Amino acid sequence: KIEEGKLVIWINGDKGYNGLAEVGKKFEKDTGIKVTVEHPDKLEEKFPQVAATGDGPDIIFWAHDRFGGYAQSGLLAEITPDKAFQDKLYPFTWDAVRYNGKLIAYPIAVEALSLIYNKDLLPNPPKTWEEIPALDKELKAKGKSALMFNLQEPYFTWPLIAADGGYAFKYENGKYDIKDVGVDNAGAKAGLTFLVDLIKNKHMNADTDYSIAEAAFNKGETAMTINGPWAWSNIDTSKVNYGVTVLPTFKGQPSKPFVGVLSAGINAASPNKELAKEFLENYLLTDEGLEAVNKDKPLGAVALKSYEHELAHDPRIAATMENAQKGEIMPNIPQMSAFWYAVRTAVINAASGRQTVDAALAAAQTNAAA
Amino acid sequence: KIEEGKLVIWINGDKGYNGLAEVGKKFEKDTGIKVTVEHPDKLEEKFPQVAATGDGPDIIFWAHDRFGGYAQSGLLAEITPDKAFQDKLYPFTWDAVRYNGKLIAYPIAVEALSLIYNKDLLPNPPKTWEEIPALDKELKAKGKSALMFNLQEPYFTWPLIAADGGYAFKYENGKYDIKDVGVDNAGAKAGLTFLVDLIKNKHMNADTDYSIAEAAFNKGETAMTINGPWAWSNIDTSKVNYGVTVLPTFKGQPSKPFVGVLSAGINAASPNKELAKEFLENYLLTDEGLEAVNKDKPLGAVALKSYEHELAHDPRIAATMENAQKGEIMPNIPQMSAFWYAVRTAVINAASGRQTVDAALAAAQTNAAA
Amino acid sequence: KIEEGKLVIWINGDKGYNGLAEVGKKFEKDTGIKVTVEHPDKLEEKFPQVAATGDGPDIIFWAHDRFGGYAQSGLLAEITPDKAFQDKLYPFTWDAVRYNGKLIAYPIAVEALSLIYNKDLLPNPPKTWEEIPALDKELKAKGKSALMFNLQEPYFTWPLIAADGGYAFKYENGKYDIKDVGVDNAGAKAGLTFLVDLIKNKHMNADTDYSIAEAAFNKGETAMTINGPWAWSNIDTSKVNYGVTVLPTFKGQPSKPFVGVLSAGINAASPNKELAKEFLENYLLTDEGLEAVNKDKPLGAVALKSYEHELAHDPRIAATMENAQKGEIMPNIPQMSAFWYAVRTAVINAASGRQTVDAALAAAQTNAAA
Numbered sequence A, B, C: 001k002i003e004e005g006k007l008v009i010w011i012n013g014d015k016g017y018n019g020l021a022e023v024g025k026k027f028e029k030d031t032g033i034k035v036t037v038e039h040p041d042k043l044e045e046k047f048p049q050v051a052a053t054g055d056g057p058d059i060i061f062w063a064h065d066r067f068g069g070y071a072q073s074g075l076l077a078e079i080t081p082d083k084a085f086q087d088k089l090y091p092f093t094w095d096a097v098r099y100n101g102k103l104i105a106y107p108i109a110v111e112a113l114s115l116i117y118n119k120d121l122l123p124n125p126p127k128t129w130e131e132i133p134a135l136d137k138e139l140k141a142k143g144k145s146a147l148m149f150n151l152q153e154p155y156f157t158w159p160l161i162a163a164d165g166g167y168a169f170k171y172e173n174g175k176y177d178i179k180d181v182g183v184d185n186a187g188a189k190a191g192l193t194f195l196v197d198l199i200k201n202k203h204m205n206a207d208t209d210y211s212i213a214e215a216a217f218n219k220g221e222t223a224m225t226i227n228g229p230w231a232w233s234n235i236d237t238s239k240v241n242y243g244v245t246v247l248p249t250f251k252g253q254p255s256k257p258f259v260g261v262l263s264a265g266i267n268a269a270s271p272n273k274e275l276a277k278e279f280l281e282n283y284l285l286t287d288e289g290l291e292a293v294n295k296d297k298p299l300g301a302v303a304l305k306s307y308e309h310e311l312a313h314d315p316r317i318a319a320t321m322e323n324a325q326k327g328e329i330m331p332n333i334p335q336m337s338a339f340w341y342a343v344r345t346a347v348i349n350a351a352s353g354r355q356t357v358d359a360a361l362a363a364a365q366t367n368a369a370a
């Protein structure tokens, strides 16, 4: 069971957990309630297992996409903010945390992938994806690579796949068609083909995960990377003269990244819902609260209006927001996990050569649909 | 008819329309709703013509004085903010936008006139009006004039007229007597006589309008001007070492400027009232929203408390406030258009010599009353 | 009777009254309502006398401890803020201003006592009280004293008393036992004994009041002092290189200061309750309002969320919080005046030698209980 009188919080490792722990400490000082901040491996998979039994954390942090499915699975409590608190945040962020006409999580920040480049190694970043092979030929001679990013999570190769015309589920007449999946189309195929051609032409490596790509960029080995705001902290630590810009185009089309909204959900099994509400509304969703988390690892474009001016003029944030506009806010619909798992398998097998782009993407399309 | 699915905004040319257009752009990004910002000539006269037919803008920007009349004419929608949003603004600003117990517009900023002077040509501005003729003589020798302001709008002449006793309508027992007008009294007569004597003693020119004065002050031709916050932008551009101070006194009495509250009204014929509400409450009446507009042309003392410490410590603002406090917030009552037209005619004819101060002001008093 | 149409405010002589007067001036400039700010001697005693008759101030400022008693005496109006305004402040601060399920005052700031030391005289301030006598011997050689604080108010000698075991009233099962008083226990006795031993060993003076101490610290005569945020202003004026730190430990136990919340109450006899509400909610409890008061004399840790960041990163404030966390927020229960009066007598008589620590504290325990 979940311990009453205290608060357990689960948040991802790539995020500002130590910052969030300080907020929890600040909350314990005023209230005398212990706040434990954990970062379990594979928490997005782990949570729905434990929550079903009545165990797990009091509060769950993840991007809105996994939230609709949890709500459908009857794992999330219905959040009850008054119009006063709701007005403190951007309505579009509230739309992201709504499932079945109910508010299921608290929106924290809008996170988007951006083109991060070494200003010293590359003063002018490429406007197109197409010019990247030529650019790596130049850098390879200098024992450096043009670009490196996570090829183990579909979230990173997604703005490329979507740039042309690749898509998750079709949105028409105010709803998503769960049977209409666009991970098999000409646009999706062209996108992933280009990526596999890069690996094939010794421009990228299929094995490249989150860490390896970060190490390479932060150590100056690679001139470019694809990542979100959270990454910026370690890039600062590395003292690399870096710029955060708009992602490269593909077939004259802008890259369309899947935009996530960091959200905080309350476990329906929690006997500490009112405390969870108090911590989220009065301690985290405050300018002091976000400052603490943002100083650890950057949140991106925050949902809290009162904290806009403090980040609104950072070019990194402006560049993130440009990509956000070029991309699309992810659906929260329960089918998203099925979609992600299907694309994860498709990208991995195509990159490794285990399956053809065409065969793998075809399987994904079937697997993503019910 | 008014186009549904989009917003049309009318605002005065002296205000920050390009700044407001950026807010509209920011609103289109998040919502996908086009926001057109227009600045028609004579919009305060133009709006009630078009609104009566069912056409015109979705949102109208003007000072609160014209709003009560529009509301009575059945042209303005009743604004519906929740106590949460209402608390974000100064209650006195809300009082200005209330007509017949209904909130008929959104208060933006408190605007008052100040005496703006060239620090190089005049290091010590006159405390009194009575000392401007002598000061003008000294400056004429140096090929310059002491003071120049718009003599075509009674707004700029009113602080002098109201100084020793002029008034629009008598306020007693919580209401205005529409039959009791004070544009004819000894104080109103003394005030306008002094102004006409200045023109008569070649210290001012009856022809001088807003731009003639703007040019003369910004080009260094005149040592003083009478204007509002909106003007400051062009004075900055001109690189004139300027100070914004308290208006001169007349007969030891302070100048009494008619204080205006820039307000945003929703056209009752608009099929986009909910969008208009969303734009005004969530996009403009925000620290980011006001910043955008204020950076184009200064708003004055804003109605939004959260924004105050960003303009509060500006000495120009302190002077706008000194003047505002010495003056009186304009009534919104319908007979304000009638009053303004009557005084405009009175000021013009007295300045031009076409009519005597006494004859013109007597006519005004009759014309202003029903 | 209380004058109708104008506000009268009473606030303590050690607080930022001139700052508060500026807020009142700002309120008069927008509303045309005169705001008189007074600081009467012994106002916490004076108010309940005059309020009972129907006279006194419109608004009373004091720490929350005296308010519960005033409310019971039927002197305070029930404050009516909407959830929107209530959310602008920390809920724990609202708990302090609640008596009998009614909100009886507005919470302004959290004030606690800290150890203030001369960095030039003392580079590393003592971590324990036990090392103070030895410290003093060294400073006497340099013609200085180690520590000086007000021995005329139990508020300053209370962190020492409470440290090893002292307490006002026992809190169990969500309520205070008014018959169970802990001013007589082993911990309370040890604490006050140590203080009397300091006076006895010519390390402190029984006569020392607030000003005697303020002067000695600010003139460089004493290396240490015990005071609250309000004091900082004059220490700045004195140009003494000072640090604000955690209070010394006693028997390895932290000093437990009785934490106060500066609160604003509305006199139940006032005919200006709505004006009082408007001034408190829209003028003082704003970032501009607390800036004004704070600039005069520092408030401490404010209840208003939006202003936190301005004072949050001040090390003096961090030390105020550090100590407050070690201490306990005072009860507001009507027996509090009975407690303070009883302890005041006990401390005075023990210090002066008039009574033994044991005899005086025993009398206090009886006197504090009903």
Ligand SMILES: OC[C@H]1O[C@H](O[C@H]2[C@H](O)[C@@H](O)[C@@H](O)O[C@@H]2CO)[C@H](O)[C@@H](O)[C@@H]1O
Residues within 6 Å of the ligand: A012, A014, A044, A063, A065, A066, A111, A153, A154, A155, A156, A228, A260, A337, A340
């Ligand atoms: O890649 C599958 C995965 O994509 C997204 O995950 C992101 C997350 O949103 C980011 O903020 C950061 O944590 O990195 C992850 C990618 O490694 C979806 O939100 C997630 O549900 C999905 O399964």
Ligand SMILES: OC[C@H]1O[C@H](O[C@H]2[C@H](O)[C@@H](O)[C@@H](O)O[C@@H]2CO)[C@H](O)[C@@H](O)[C@@H]1O
Residues within 6 Å of the ligand: B012, B014, B044, B063, B064, B065, B066, B111, B153, B154, B155, B156, B228, B260, B340
């Ligand atoms: O002059 C008559 C006029 O006075 C005010 O108009 C002001 C307006 O308030 C300002 O925003 C600025 O733009 O200058 C105008 C002066 O031309 C009243 O608001 C108005 O209704 C009245 O006609």
Ligand SMILES: OC[C@H]1O[C@H](O[C@H]2[C@H](O)[C@@H](O)[C@@H](O)O[C@@H]2CO)[C@H](O)[C@@H](O)[C@@H]1O
Residues within 6 Å of the ligand: C012, C014, C044, C062, C063, C065, C066, C111, C153, C154, C155, C156, C228, C260, C340
């Ligand atoms: O010492 C007895 C006294 O302590 C507290 O008073 C504090 C007050 O809270 C502060 O605002 C500051 O001015 O100093 C006071 C000490 O004089 C209690 O709040 C008070 O009721 C009590 O009598």
Ligand SMILES: [Cl-]
Residues within 6 Å of the ligand: A306, B306, C306
């Ligand atoms: Cl705010």
Ligand SMILES: [Zn+2]
Residues within 6 Å of the ligand: A308, A309, A310, A312, A313, B287, B288, B291
């Ligand atoms: Zn800004």
Ligand SMILES: [Zn+2]
Residues within 6 Å of the ligand: B308, B309, B310, B312, B313, C287, C288, C291
């Ligand atoms: Zn300020």
Ligand SMILES: [Zn+2]
Residues within 6 Å of the ligand: A287, A288, A291, C308, C309, C310, C312, C313
């Ligand atoms: Zn901060």
